[PDB]
């Protein structure tokens, strides 16, 4: 769900805490899946608990709401007033 959310809308600032939690969750999921196929139910349960905590801390982070960020379409409309001054060097480097 987190991967799909971040791939759908490319204006979410995912910071180091979210990335750390995602990495911890993936590592713990892999460890718990590799420990469940062993005489290691206790370690597998602890790893699953860690994976859930990390994945839900990464998913339910305050910073993943798409209202905190300026819309990408309008980001290229608030820059045209700077396109007008910057259109002169780019054109006059080619005309001369």
């Amino acid at each position: 769900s987190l991967a799909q959310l971040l791939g759908k809308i490319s204006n979410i600032v995912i910071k180091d805490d979210v990335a750390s939690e995602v990495y911890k969750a993936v590592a713990a999921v892999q460890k718990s899946a590799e420990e469940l196929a062993s005489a290691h139910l206790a370690s597998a349960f602890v790893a699953s608990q860690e994976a859930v905590t990390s994945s839900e801390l990464a998913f339910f982070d305050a910073s993943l709401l798409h209202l905190l960020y300026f819309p990408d379409d309008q980001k290229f409309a608030i820059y045209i007033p700077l396109f007008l001054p910057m259109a002169v060097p780019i054109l006059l480097s080619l005309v001369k």
Binding site: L5, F59, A62, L64, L65, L67
Partner: protein, 247 residues
Amino acid sequence: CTSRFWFNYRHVANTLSVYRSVKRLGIPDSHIVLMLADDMACNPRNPKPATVFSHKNMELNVYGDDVEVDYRSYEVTVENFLRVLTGRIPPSTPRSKRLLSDDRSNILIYMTGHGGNGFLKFQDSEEITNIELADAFEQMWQKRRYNELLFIIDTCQGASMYERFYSPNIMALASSQVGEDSLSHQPDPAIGVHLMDRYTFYVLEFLEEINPASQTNMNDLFQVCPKSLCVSTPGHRTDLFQRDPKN
């Protein structure tokens, strides 16, 4: 209720009527996340303090003696609303100010306020669009944070707020259709401002006649407000619900 300024008393009354019906029918205060962008219940301009009325006769106080507002005044923002639905609230938020729903949870969501085409104004300042609402509902469904969801909106052109929903189990009601925007205005002489939106008034009247152990079904609430009674055409939407509304 995404409305302030005491002349939007109709919206606070809509929300409090839905709240009164819901709390009379069983849902506890802890499981209701009530949002009133302005009190209008006992602000100084109220001729009858600590009361909100549904009718000119002033015989049914939807703002009863047992009411809890989890989000009020400046806390009721589009940001906070989407935070509550998507679960991305700040970590210090208490239990009572969040939607701690699970895969076995039925959720009723009632939005009221000024609303234009596929958008709802929050306290005359900011905006929630049907795209954002649909995305939040999808995010809720991804985590299985609701079993079935009933969305009701009582704004102008409110049938387009539920026009971009894709999450599997949602059925939606609306006071008006894509186009009709005529907003009713009949201020009570006693209470200076308007009382209700005439749609949730009939929903309230429909919901006042049932008991907690009532077998009335969604098909009996899909025609609670006819064209003869509320000028606008209340349009529902069951393209997602697996279960038949008559059950």
